[model samples]
Target: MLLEAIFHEAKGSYAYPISETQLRVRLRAKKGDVVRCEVLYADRYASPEEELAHALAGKAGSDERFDYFEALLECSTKRVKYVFLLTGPQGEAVYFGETGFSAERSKAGVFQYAYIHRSEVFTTPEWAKEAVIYQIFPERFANGDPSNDPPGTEQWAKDARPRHDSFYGGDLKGVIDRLPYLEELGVTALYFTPIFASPSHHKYDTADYLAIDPQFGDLPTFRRLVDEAHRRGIKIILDAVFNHAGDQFFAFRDVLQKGEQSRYKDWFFIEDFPVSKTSRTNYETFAVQVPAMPKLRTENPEVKEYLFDVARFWMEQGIDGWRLNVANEVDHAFWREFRRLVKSLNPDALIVGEIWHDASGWLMGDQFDSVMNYLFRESVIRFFATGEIHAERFDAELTRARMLYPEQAAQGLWNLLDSHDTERFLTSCGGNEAKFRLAVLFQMTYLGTPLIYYGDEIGMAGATDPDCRRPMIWEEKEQNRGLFEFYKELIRLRHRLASLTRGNVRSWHADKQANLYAFVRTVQDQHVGVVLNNRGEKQTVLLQVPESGGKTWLDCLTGEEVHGKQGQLKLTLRPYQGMILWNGR
Candidate 1:
């Protein structure tokens, strides 16, 4: 009976409130261990006779060691107590509860859910849940205003390798010029890297938090960009680099001049009087010892208020929300207050943290709404780009990731393949366009918001850091037209399918030897299925989709109608190809 393999927790992802009246509970057990499982629950104060039972649906999702089971508990009374009843393959019954397994239900300790508080139920903005984000490195996107170009700015070249000091004069006006292009691409949101005044090409080190970088544009130009973007129904999310400030920042400069007697000495973490910027730094910086960027003491009340004011100022400018840089290094208390201030200003505003790993801590209701999902990127890179993992391993990795947070936070996660920080997905795939396409197909169909790095749609390729931040390809002849069209179609398809945007995802099939993976996203009667062939040769596979009963499925990509007889679908996919199959609306 593998009693040691059974497990459940009454907190976090295991137990969470989806709504005021509905609670979702999850249980984990060794693969193929239990044949049947049911949850018996009732109000904590209710009599034993009032207990009701609901069978938990077994999910196709599984890691190497375990399988997951889930069920929704709808309660008239908010508080409840519950226990699990498991039936092994041999018909051996076991009662599982908070304390431990018991031979009799009466001997088991009941798990308690005190109440489903409305405030505790995690809620993200509706718009954010369905957003397709396009992330832009502002300095390299385009140059609309040559007159405002920074002195000695490099000439715009699509193939030129960028350096730390290089700038192509891309400005807010350039973004304004491309609004139609973005609208055509079907992107719902734009996330720009720091556009604040700074000396460096990348404006992470903010010299002036309140002012826009002159090289990019003035405040008026930014206002116009925001207004025009809103007119086109595209939301704006600006990067917030509050974890540190540039040494050229007003407070830091004042401290640099006044030494120990500076009034702003408390603003930074200064170790000793007469701060040294050379050799061994006397004050803390963003990372090791970069004198240009100084880490701020966010725990201090003054620093907290100043940063909050900066956020408030931008929100007032009609910005949709913020993507916080180096968010984990800062204190939790500061983020809690930041969430309150941003939500107060605009309840629908999204707050995304630049977290590269498991971010469950910051994703609780009191902090950020989502994070830059680098974990998803790593998994994609391994499975599709590098071919380091098989289809089964990829599915397991994804399933574990989906279970890390509540459904709402998981949907809001900024799933990205490449960013300003990493090598391009195509580059990682050794310039194999087929592999890149398969990865993009999975990303667009998977749960969470898909984030496209600037120039990626046109097949831009580069290595990490300075290379990944190359200028955008504006020449239609030079761009990979086919790849661009593929991105456009995928984005449009995602927008048209409600189930793809907001639905429960479950594994449909996985073949390690064939290097194929298939999954389904279902919302009520709507279902969208995605099948990917990661191998180089064509392969035929059969998927058993119980929901496909006497229904004809349409391949959204090819417009080919397919029939599944008796809930069986036989599909043949080309080399490194993918398909999106949808049961008609």
Candidate 2:
């Protein structure tokens, strides 16, 4: 037995509450070392001699050296005691309890998580699970009110090539005018980039934290927009940029005028008495010495009150939640207070962070609910866009990403193929719509909220950064009508399917050389099977589906039905084709 290779901890992702009533326990063992592993869990008050329970854990995934196993237990009363039973090579059995490695199973050393408290249970908005979020760069989506256009606002159709300083007069009224269009596209939620008063068109550099940008509209206009969107069943989440303030921000300006004598000098990290004009300033700035934006001392009481008040004021005026910018840079103490404040106002309100890395720290049932899952982007870009990695590696990579957080938190991850920061999905795929289409299929069916960057559904293509931020193409002839139709269909299908949104996801089959990947999603009696072929040639793949009477699976996209008897199934795919199969009731 490779006893040294076994590992587990009673806290963190190794063992955490997936909900108020369910606990997820996980263990890591050296890859290919253990033949079988089982988790024996029971109530802390129960003994194995009286009545014990055991569950076989599914092989979650494997890194280079270790394989992960996971088992979820439903503790109706919220208490759990657990231990692992490992069967190694040559059928040697060992028990891994809290004490140490032992030949005999013992309850004395069993691992115990005293309780899954409601206060610590990880939760996201229930509405968000079924939400197909549409991310709008308000300045570039549409121009409903040319009267509010900034001085340099250009005609969107005339000048499609956009720069950092470009503005096309897209506003809240413009979004209001397009509510029917969004509803038709099946978007249930809207994520607008920094909509507060800012000098730049992107609006990240906020001139005023409390007011809406004049170019976008006034408070009443935004209120009306919110009302109109809710009428169509669309929830709104605005950006909250609390990490820094613009150079023109009132408090920061006061500091510049009064120097060190300013009452608000402590609001920011000002290192020197007089701010310098040398190569780098003595004062701390956003990204160091970019004087246009100064990093705020979020730990300061005054700054915390101002930011929290801004958050409270927005929710009072009827905004759903916030998408926190530079959330990691802020102190955790502040976020804990922020969560207490926000959840007090509305328990269903969501708080998603702009974090781009592993977010296990911020997602401990406090701070933020979930993060902008850039890991999903990295994996998708590597597999679908660039084709640098094959299907087996892609499956393994995605599995590892899923295992990074608690199951409930993973379900609410903001999955996006491309965003304002990266090149368009089609552009990343070198103008191959087929590759991008496969990615969209996976995005819709995958376990998380899918974010459609503005113009991506319409086949808008651009290079990185400024290029990706181009004006929206409203002309039907100019847009990729076919791709738009594909997006609409996918979103419609996603909205209608419960299993796709709130289902248990597990890989059914993955092929390295053949470049094929298949996964099954199951929720209650509903089951969804999806397969993707990334190869250049047509191929056949076999899947071991669980038996469900003698019903055949129908491809939801293609309408092709295939027979699967006694849990064995076969599927054929054309070059670069994808299938969404579900049993036809």
Candidate 3:
């Protein structure tokens, strides 16, 4: 068999750590390159157990060199799925070496703008159709452990303990202590910030992946959070910081000690330079004077093994899933392998990526069940409330997003209006409750999973990173108690509206002049219309809509009657007013 072939392009090595059982993968071939493949079983890297059989791979005359190879698995499971990713480069032959590696489980949502893996049972999961999520920056949520709170940081705030470069009282115990509060908000799941052992309070720069941060009150608290959250019928997902690490990280510190001779020297994109006393001068760049945080080189073997262990180790703790941070910067090659390995261990585990983008095409087969949906909410707010742009294409834009994504990837979209990274949506809109309510409605009703920023519901507002991540304030009579109550009722209504949750969205009308866009969502026996007015003032607009069998709905917020006569309705929309008009069945 022709195992080795000339690239005729650039030189790279292709070696399989595991042997083939049966292979079904996306392969690249160039014309005139007659490549062939065979299967063998081996325990060691190079030893083979079976005699090799030849199969022709790439044929000439095709601009794209090769033929797609999709055979069977050595396992008798009747090959249902395969997540074949190019670990080497384009045109490299991919055979499941006798070590016999097949895509482990099912879907991996690459980005919220997700595509499907070529080999999978379904593109999207069932839960994401209309799930509403609550994003909790663990530290600020509710510190259940006052004892665990780091000693003197409380100086930043009068009421709560301050947590800056230090660890405050936020821990898994705190989260478990408030499952009732989260469930009360009608959230189906809670997405927590990284809980892994790390030096900082944010916990992004991880020191160890498997162990829970000690300040979080140990492993039992974590297990309790997962178990307790599950008891309340809510899911839990944690952040996976794959990008960089704290100065105390093993790899970066190793390089500083041994320089080029360090076994861990190649673990990062370390420049070969004399080590300087200044932290910033010694390394490359400071991603915001965070000299302690250094980036990782995913191509390194030790790094890959270490990261894979990170995902698998905690997953065994009975946690629901993961949320990958800085997902775009992560090595796709590593993610492809990571996704496969994860699925084998837990088929139901969700993998959410934090790409802050419309990573639409990466989902076919990779390590992400869903991604943090930034663009959807950003564009919506830009067009509707803040009027970031005069062009109103939300109806068309939203349709395009879901259309571009594969069926398997549909459920992988986790929508959010504001997060710990950005200004609170309420404040961003210049502190208007009406617009904030409308924004929440949009997030709650939209496709994919809905995510709420840490302090959004109770009227907490701040601008940018550290500010947006301020400690949660619970002093008021629930502060924005009315809004909080409204959210619960609204979410309950949303939960019942199966059609609105998982229905197909079709554009009914989008008027750039009026800045009003409308669409219909239909599922099973339910049909509803959603309309938002971005116009400056109150205006009665007559717009055409799809003929459907449903009465006009009352604006959930303003109690405005939206009556449609013969598939057409004159809507009296307030400034930045939006309504989820649906049959209140």
Top-TM-score structure, candidate number: 1
Q: Model 2, poorest ten-residue lDDT window?
A: 542-551
Best by lDDT: 1
lDDT of 3 by residue, 1-585 (tens): 133432211001111001123332223333234345332221222223434233333221122223222222232222222223222334554433222333321131110101122363333445655567788887667788877776554532424333345444666787887788888887888888887777677888777777787777688887877888888878777887777766677767777788888887777665556555374555543364456667777767788888878777788788767788787887788787777777779776677777776676465434566677767877767765587654345654565455444434644477788787777787788887876787677667766677777668788777767667777766666378878877886688678788657665555567778877666666765666677776668777776754555545655555647567877777777786776766554
TM-score of each: 0.97, 0.95, 0.74
Model 2 Cα displacement at 403 (Å)?
0.8
Q: Which is superior by lDDT, 2 or 3? A: 2
Q: Record all residue pairs in model 2 with backbone atoms less than 3 Å apart, i.e. clashing.
A: none
lDDT of 2 at 372: 88
Local accuracy of candidate 2 as per-residue lDDT tens digits, 1-585 = 667888888888889987788888889888887778898788888765866677788787675467889888777768888779888778888889998888777742788899888888877778878889999999889889888799888767735788878888999899999999899888988999998899898888889888889999999999998899999999989998999888788988888889978888988887787866367877777785677678889999989999998888888778887888888998999989998999899988888998889989888777787888988999899998898998888888888878788777788889998888889989899998888899998998998889999988888888888899988888888888898889888898887778888886877688888989888777887778889898778998878866762358878887866667667887778988989888654
Rank order by lDDT, top first?
A: 1, 2, 3
Error in Å for residue 251 of model 3: 3.8
TM-score of 3: 0.74
Q: What lDDT tens digits, residue by residue, belong to model 1 across residues 181-205?
A: 9998889999999999999899989
For residue 163, model 1's alpha carbon misses the true position, in angstroms, by 1.3
The parts of candidate 3 lying over 4 Å away from their true place are 1-118, 155-168, 277-290, 365-367, 545-548, 551-567, 583-585
lDDT of 3: 0.62
